[PDB]
């Protein structure tokens, strides 16, 4: 479950949050494939609750009604069509598996579901699965409210309702099987792995028992013996009885310390400065690199939702955001996930975004397609951070330098740093209030290199800044403190 299963030479997965299957399918063939992306994390593909108050919030997709592959992103035909087309061009699909619970216990019974299935939360009735009262932890939970009341109690965090969400009895073989059934449906369709939603709220053993029932990946695209890639969502910033390491047996785990710390550093808050990033990684208290699923922000924290703090950088902070993502993509630590979002009508009430619930761009509830402007940007309020040249070129930078060791690090004691990856790449950052002008050892072979942040290499020339690495591997860098993108990057494939 530790192998990404991505095509030979691809190191990142992008989260196309709330995107529709047909758009992802197209996105794979026209952009993701030729741009070297490894895979796409898709929003939950199973039928969820249609919550009309508020109007179709993004979080309704985290409230299962059944395992029918029918959502606002598309039906089963479209889902299968997407997986096939993406796999045919070397781009993998990773499913966000919401298996810890069904919907909120207070949701009204009826057919307000993305596929019309009937369900009765009050009576614990989900016939489309089917699940009955016998399949939830109502009698196992020992709290007075029946919900999770204290995270200092590892047991209730696992057996009680997460904010009211009906907690599935993952200890029962029947439930474990119904879930395995759903996941094998996805695997057989072509899925390459899963993001396991709310991993902290399930015993590491129940998850395992579920994974033990899964098929090997589709043998038309994946080698024999291939197991689904597994990265469990566990928010652990320390201090809790539950640790991210408790899940290393099932696969990789989300490292929420990564984004929180990088953001505080890049924003230069709490006395942090980029020069401190020289021992970035385990040296900062993070989990082992071979188990970490890193990212700057995710669909949750870019909204402050159960977020890791205000330090989290997002597309709203474009300039600093690109530096954060660039550094992550260049640093060998962990497996990188790039975020891609939609712009919502953010409105504050003093540290309160009352519009953080707003779902994806839509027309009366129907998710809007992703239009592609000529400058390769996206319309209909889709941010598409993964298409920003600075991020897109850094995704390839990670591919190019893959396997090379972190070396040639330099820092000015403040916020001007630079480091390379073996003899295949070198990146430079200036986050100080003055100019960064210096000759640095890049560890790269002599030549003229295109800065892949400012431009691209095309027809034996650069469209942006050019860097000249002399015979001893040294090159001059000059990044103004007021540059729109205060960082430069070059690698073996950007060389003329
Ligand atoms: Ca649970
Ligand atoms: Cl996540």
Swiss-Prot record:
Cofactor: Ca(2+); chloride
A GO term, aspect molecular function: chloride ion binding
InterPro entries in alphabetical order: A-amylase/branching_C, A-amylase_C, Alpha_amylase, Glyco_hydro_13_cat_dom, Glyco_hydro_b, Glycoside_hydrolase_SF
Amino acids binding Ca(2+): 100, 158, 167, 201
Domain of life: Eukaryota
Active-site residues, record numbering mapped to chain: 197 (nucleophile), 233 (proton donor)
Subcellular localization, as worded in the UniProt entry: Secreted
Function: Calcium-binding enzyme that initiates starch digestion in the oral cavity. Catalyzes the hydrolysis of internal (1->4)-alpha-D-glucosidic bonds, yielding a mixture of maltose, isomaltose, small amounts of glucose as well as small linear and branched oligosaccharides called dextrins.
Protein name (record): Alpha-amylase 1A
Species in which this protein is naturally found: Homo sapiens
Source taxonomy: Eukaryota, Metazoa, Chordata, Craniata, Vertebrata
């Amino acid at each position: 479950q530790y192998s990404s299963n991505t095509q030979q030479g691809r190191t990142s997965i992008v989260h196309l949050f709330e995107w529709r299957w047909v758009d992802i399918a197209l996105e794979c063939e026209r952009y993701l494939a030729p741009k070297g992306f490894g895979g796409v994390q898709v929003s939950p593909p199973n039928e969820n609750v249609a919550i009309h108050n508020p109007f179709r919030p993004w979080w309704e997709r985290y409230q299962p009604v059944s395992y029918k592959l029918c959502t606002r992103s598309g039906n089963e035909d479209e889902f299968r069509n997407m997986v096939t087309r993406c796999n045919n061009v070397g781009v993998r699909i990773y499913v966000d598996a919401v298996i810890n619970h069904m919907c909120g216990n207070a949701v009204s019974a009826g057919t307000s579901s993305t596929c019309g299935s009937y369900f009765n939360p009050g009576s614990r009735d989900f016939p489309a699965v089917p699940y009955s009262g016998w399949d939830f932890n109502d009698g196992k939970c020992k709290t007075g409210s029946g919900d999770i009341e204290n995270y200092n109690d590892a047991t209730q965090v696992r057996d009680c309702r997460l904010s009211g969400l009906l907690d599935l009895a993952l200890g029962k073989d029947y439930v474990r099987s119904k879930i395995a059934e759903y996941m094998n449906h996805l695997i057989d369709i072509g899925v390459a792995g899963f993001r396991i939603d709310a991993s902290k709220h399930m015993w590491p053993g129940d998850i395992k028992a579920i994974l033990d029932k899964l098929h090997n990946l589709n043998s038309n695209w994946f080698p024999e013996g291939s197991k689904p890639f597994i990265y469990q969502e566990v928010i652990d910033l320390g201090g809790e009885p539950i640790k991210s390491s408790d899940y290393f047996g099932n696969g990789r785990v989300t490292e929420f310390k990564y984004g929180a710390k990088l953001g505080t550093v890049i924003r230069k808050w709490n006395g942090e400065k980029m020069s401190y990033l020289k021992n970035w990684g385990e040296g900062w208290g993070f989990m082992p690199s071979d188990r970490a699923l890193v990212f700057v922000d995710n669909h949750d924290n870019q909204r402050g939702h159960g977020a890791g703090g205000a330090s989290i950088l997002t597309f709203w902070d474009a300039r600093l955001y690109k530096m954060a993502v660039g550094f992550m993509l260049a640093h060998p630590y962990g497996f990188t996930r790039v975020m891609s979002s939609y712009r919502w009508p953010r409105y504050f009430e003093n540290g309160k975004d009352v519009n953080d619930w707003v779902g994806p761009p839509n027309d009366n509830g129907v998710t809007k397609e992703v239009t592609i402007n000529p400058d390769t940007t996206c319309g209909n309020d889709w941010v598409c951070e993964h298409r920003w040249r600075q991020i897109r070129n850094m995704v390839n930078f990670r591919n190019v330098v893959d396997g090379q060791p972190f070396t040639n690090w330099y820092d000015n004691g403040s916020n001007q740093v630079a480091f390379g990856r073996g003899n295949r790449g070198f990146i430079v950052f200036n986050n100080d209030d003055w100019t960064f002008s210096l000759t640095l050892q890049t560890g790269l072979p002599a030549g003229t290199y295109c800065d892949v942040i400012s431009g691209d290499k095309i027809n034996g020339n650069c469209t942006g800044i050019k860097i000249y690495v002399s015979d001893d591997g040294k090159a001059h860098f000059s990044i103004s403190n007021s540059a729109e993108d205060p960082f430069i990057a070059i690698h073996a494939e950007s060389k003329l």
